[PDB]
Amino acid sequence: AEPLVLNSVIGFGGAIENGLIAHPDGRTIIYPLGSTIVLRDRADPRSQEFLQGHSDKVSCLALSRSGRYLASGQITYMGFTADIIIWDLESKQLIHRMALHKVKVQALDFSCDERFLASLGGQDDNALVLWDVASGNAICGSPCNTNFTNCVKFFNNSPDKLITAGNFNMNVWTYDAGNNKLRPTDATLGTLKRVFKSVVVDANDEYAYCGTTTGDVLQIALERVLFKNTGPAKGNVQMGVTATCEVPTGDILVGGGDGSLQVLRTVPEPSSTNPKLLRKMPALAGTKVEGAITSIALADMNARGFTFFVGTAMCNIYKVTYEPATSRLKEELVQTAHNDKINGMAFPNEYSEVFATCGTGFIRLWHLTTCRELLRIAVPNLECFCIAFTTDGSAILSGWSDGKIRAFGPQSGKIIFTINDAHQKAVTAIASTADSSRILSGGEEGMVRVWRIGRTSQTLEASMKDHKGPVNCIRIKGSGDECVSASSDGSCILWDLHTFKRRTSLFANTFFKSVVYHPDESQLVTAGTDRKVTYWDAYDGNAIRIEVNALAVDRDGEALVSGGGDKLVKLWGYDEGHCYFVGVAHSGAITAVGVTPDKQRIVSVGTEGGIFIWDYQRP
Amino acid sequence: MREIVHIQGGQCGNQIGAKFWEVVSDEHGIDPTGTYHGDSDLQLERINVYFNEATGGRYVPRAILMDLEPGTMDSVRSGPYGQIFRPDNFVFGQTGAGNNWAKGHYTEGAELIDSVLDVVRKEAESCDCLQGFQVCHSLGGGTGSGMGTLLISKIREEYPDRMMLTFSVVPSPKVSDTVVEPYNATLSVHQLVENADECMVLDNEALYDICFRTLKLTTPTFGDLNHLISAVMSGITCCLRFPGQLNADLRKLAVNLIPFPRLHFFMVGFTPLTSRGSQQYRALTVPELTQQMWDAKNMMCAADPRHGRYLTASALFRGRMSTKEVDEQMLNVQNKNSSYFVEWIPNNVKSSVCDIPPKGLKMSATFIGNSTAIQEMFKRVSEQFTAMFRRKAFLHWYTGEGMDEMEFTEAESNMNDLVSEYQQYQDA
Amino acid sequence: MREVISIHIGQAGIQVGNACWELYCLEHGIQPDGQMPSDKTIGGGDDAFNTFFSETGAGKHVPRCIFLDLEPTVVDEVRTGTYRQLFHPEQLISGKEDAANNFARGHYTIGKEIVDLALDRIRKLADNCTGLQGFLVFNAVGGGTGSGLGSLLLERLSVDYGKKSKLGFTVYPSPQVSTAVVEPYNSVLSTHSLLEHTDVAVMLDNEAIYDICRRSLDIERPTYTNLNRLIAQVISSLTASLRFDGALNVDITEFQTNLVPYPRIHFMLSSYAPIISAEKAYHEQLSVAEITNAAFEPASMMVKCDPRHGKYMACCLMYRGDVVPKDVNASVATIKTKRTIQFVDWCPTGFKCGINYQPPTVVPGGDLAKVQRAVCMISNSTAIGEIFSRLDHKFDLMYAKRAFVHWYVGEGMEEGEFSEAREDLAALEKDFEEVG
Ligand SMILES: CC(=O)O[C@H]1C(=O)[C@@]2(C)[C@H]([C@H](OC(=O)c3ccccc3)[C@]3(O)C[C@H](OC(=O)[C@H](O)[C@@H](NC(=O)c4ccccc4)c4ccccc4)C(C)=C1C3(C)C)[C@]1(OC(C)=O)CO[C@@H]1C[C@@H]2O
């Protein structure tokens, strides 16, 4: 039926170099996700328009001038062609779907004339191809060389030449008119071996600027391609230049792989002491942002300066307003997004306004009405699993790939306790009692344990409940005292926990991912590899049997909401069993789903690195 | 355990292996990506017989592809399931074979054995319990006969205790796709007899009839013939792969089928086999499968069992059935055509069965037979060889690789000694 | 990887060298200017032409051939024709003076000065190949260059390589039609020195192909281009396995082992089918059965030799386009049922067949039609001795008179080479009778 309004989506494609784009003279920000492109309003941080036409993951993004259609590359599997896709604007649908570059797409760009679109093969199959836009067909093709190129750029004028740089090579290619060939001219630099990363061309094709892993910003002339000036004087960028762009005044924004964002005024200057010699590029303004800078786009405010949208590797979006009048550079943090593979969701009991997300680097906290994440409790190396709230409103439990559980609080302060060696390796599921007096931990090496917890003294008891495989999920009746442990063998086991004697329940047809009680009933709903949403009996039975990973229920058993390897979200009238109000466009293997108890909202989260919000209506 | 290492010699052997490794890849429910996507645990319990572990939950086939002129090895690499093979398991030489057994076994064979034998060993210790070898031949061509037997001799001197299977496809009596064919046939026979334990013989001719009449095929391509051989190649190892109320390892098939160290040339056929028409009428019953396999049509070898006498036999079913049915069926037949069997062997059949059926069907079977009618093929070949060796036709090629003529006398004498042995136990 | 070297000597050799090198560049899309569209990795097509070309540092494809001739007029024509941007002028060899239908002039006096140049280009060409399948010679017996230079070359090649295979398509002096008058001599002198140096030898004459274009194509104006147009079709059918796919691929080694029983007996015949115009193809189904019937027909042979007076020692059939091998097995059986077709006893076998999925390509403005099928046959039959014997009769008919011999002994020869080559003619002929 598909009525499900998409209220909010938080996410960002971090390490997609030059992935961030701003609509030229438009009100939209364009940036990629797991496998989609997102066009947000420039102002209203709700109006999103998503484009989903790729199969695996967007890899490169290019946008032609004049707000015209934009091209999107794609990564694919080992021996299957990539898929460049041209997406129209003013209609926001597909136009052409071109296929080459058997491994992945490395770089794309439009010419000043919107008629030519150049592509660059992956690590393997690295060749330079030209495409026509009217006919989605390849005009010209040629392999660059052994040292694989990295970035390519059309000239701002004369849309007939284009410069490309890579590992140990720079070239300028001109498209011949007599044939389907394009002739390269190599770059001549004096005994210099630089791994060029980013390349920009000035407005008038005078000088090409090129970043370097060493940290230099080599500016070269383009009439002849020879080299002119090295880079920033009074030092050197720390992690090498990664995200370079040009401000219309003739200066260059440079962002290294550490967060150093500075402005180099590049006008050929004579060396003061030695007149027949040039200086290096000075630095007008400088700042520090959080994380390696990967993408820079421009927005002409023209009142004082310019506002540049800066996407950093840490999935943060900054608004860097710089005015050269007083050489003042101020940054703002517009939007943040998680990094990758959000592992666990958590809702505080009887609270439908704030929630928490356990990811592969650390725990973040968000709230309902706005993204506006509250805090990020960081643990450097090892990743978190199965975040949990202690019942009735209490600490946050987090079991890590170390095999240790740790407790934090609201402000989360300092670690409440660390149950170390909680399992052999990689504790996987964690639950608490309704009295917050014991904590269940199901590890990845097929074991279940429980720890008794006092007020300030912890109790390490030796339950050692042996299970048949990794424990995907653990649930407990909030009404009484019981336990259910799922498995990567699907044999969901009912433990009594009064005697710890493994009430002999077993369910074996495949291996399961998520099990849920019916609220105040002897029923069960389990989800595993094969499409199975079977309703069980707590009295060793199966009421009914109807790739799925996550399940959730309402206050009462109204709407069982579900998701899995399929990129959809299925809502079910629990008692009736129909798939009403099905939602789409979650580009990746969805991992968890929540119901926001008090209100009617379904939060969905998957491995793509994003979070989605929907409403909730059941017949 | 019971891991099986696989070889694919010559073009045909390289080609039928593309199907056999495509059928089994589906029976166990893995993807051409190498990642398993079946449903049961039974696909994974004995998956080790045909595959190896790989990083990322991937399984790659334990196959070895040898061929001079690597042109065709591009085809299988471009096939839908060419992505699963280990590209270091692609041994080839650029110079052609010439359909000369000598250079395939004296000059060009010798230069690749060191590489191949390095490959075979690289995956012989990877087996916690190596059961045996298995090869895919074609006795007409130069690589298959030449390299395979030369490869076979090397295997025997280092793996004597293990068993060397051979899915050899023999030349045809009436048809000859090449001209020097009988030479490479006999010269290989002088090698198979002494360095092999079991050797099925199959021929394109009956493969054309079985395709033509029973399946009602119009245009039999090569893949279909190999599609058939892929089936009987999978029908053998159901006991090693799947459960069975009466399992049957290969080593117990050999001891149950060869009374003497040199009567080891077999004959095969598949069941059930029906077009899309009669499958809507025919029913799958134990009686159906046993009469079809016992017939003298389904024998893929171009031989007539009626002219001979079954020394031994066997049957490999698969599907949930009453084993008593199969018990009496083989007892009925052993009584009716009592002339086609031997006397000094009281019960000369082995009746195996497996509990797991084929993928889409529910029941199936496979026949094996060590009859003395197979000596008929060796009579034909021994004629053509002695006709041209009577005139030394095409012979300058063979002495052109250091070879001699005594070898042509020896190989023929052994063929005569062999066919004679199948006559002793043939008292009409 | 699988590459051959097509040599074209004499005038006819560089005449068919035009047609074949007109055919090849068309089947592969090779434009006359070396290159073709979608040449680079954008095309995604390799190995399809390496047998006949060498991609430059970028774009252009130079054909791997050699045009050799003493008459400057024809080689200078190709230098002027449309197909000049193809050939590197190191390939196109010429000389100030011709051989003028003398063997010594082609073998003893002039040939010795340019062969070294030829070998130097071959050595420049042999080193470019990774896997060399074999030499491919195009001779025209009956002239001074062909008999003189070709023979001298093959000696130089054998003492160079030996291990390499030699193959040659040579046009023989027809029994009835004869453009020259002294061709018996040089033909005799050619046959010998090629024999102990060539490994295989195909034979065919214009008079036979004169009937082919008459009976089948129904053209009344046959010229040298048409015959050469057919020879293009023949060899394209042979090399197809070297340069394409399809069931039962064949290479020269494979093809040669199962066609030459004895070191001396290697002279073979040829035939092509179907040979039809555009309209007959509309009134025809072209089943594999008829095409393989017209193949073994002694009318459709390309030489005026009757095989029904001898026995096929072996045969080789190269189909093309849409064929499935049951049909070959089907139709080849039908022939082996027939009676007019004989075989010598010691070979119960005799058929090395082959298929190729790539269709036969027609030339624009050409004469043949567009078909999905075709066959070319090559049979080594003992009936070939007859045309070998006619020349045996024309030699002594003149050598008795000692007519025209002063040219030869005057040009650095003697009478010995006549008698010496005379005995090899008889010696060969009896070998064609020993096999009975
Ligand atoms: C709906 C249905 O049942 O259709 C059948 C079917 O009708 C028939 C005609 C099938 C069908 O087979 C053929 O038509 C066929 C064509 C050429 C050569 C051989 C067979 C079938 O293709 C074959 C296929 O059989 C299998 O899949 C087997 O498990 C077989 N699998 C393969 O060969 C295979 C492998 C990879 C990819 C695709 C197929 C197998 C055999 C041994 C060991 C493991 C697997 C099935 C049941 C059917 C169809 C689809 C029509 C038959 O074959 C098999 C192997 O069962 C032909 O005689 C049987 C009788 C079946 O009734």
Ligand SMILES: Nc1nc2c(ncn2[C@@H]2O[C@H](COP(=O)(O)OP(=O)(O)OP(=O)(O)O)[C@@H](O)[C@H]2O)c(=O)[nH]1
């Ligand atoms: N079928 C066919 N025969 C040709 C063709 N061109 C020439 N011939 C024949 O070639 C024979 C003469 O060949 P030449 O090349 O001139 O002889 P030569 O060895 O070069 O010696 P010179 O003529 O002195 O240069 C004649 O019998 C021609 O019929 C052709 O294009 N097709």
Ligand SMILES: Nc1nc2c(ncn2[C@@H]2O[C@H](COP(=O)(O)OP(=O)(O)O)[C@@H](O)[C@H]2O)c(=O)[nH]1
């Ligand atoms: N079942 C089957 N048999 C084939 C196939 N291709 C060839 N054969 C037979 O293989 C024989 C030739 O052996 P080949 O491998 O080509 O020569 P070799 O490379 O020197 O060993 C011929 O008799 C063919 O008929 C095929 O695709 N399927």
Ligand SMILES: [Mg+2]
């Ligand atoms: Mg001439």
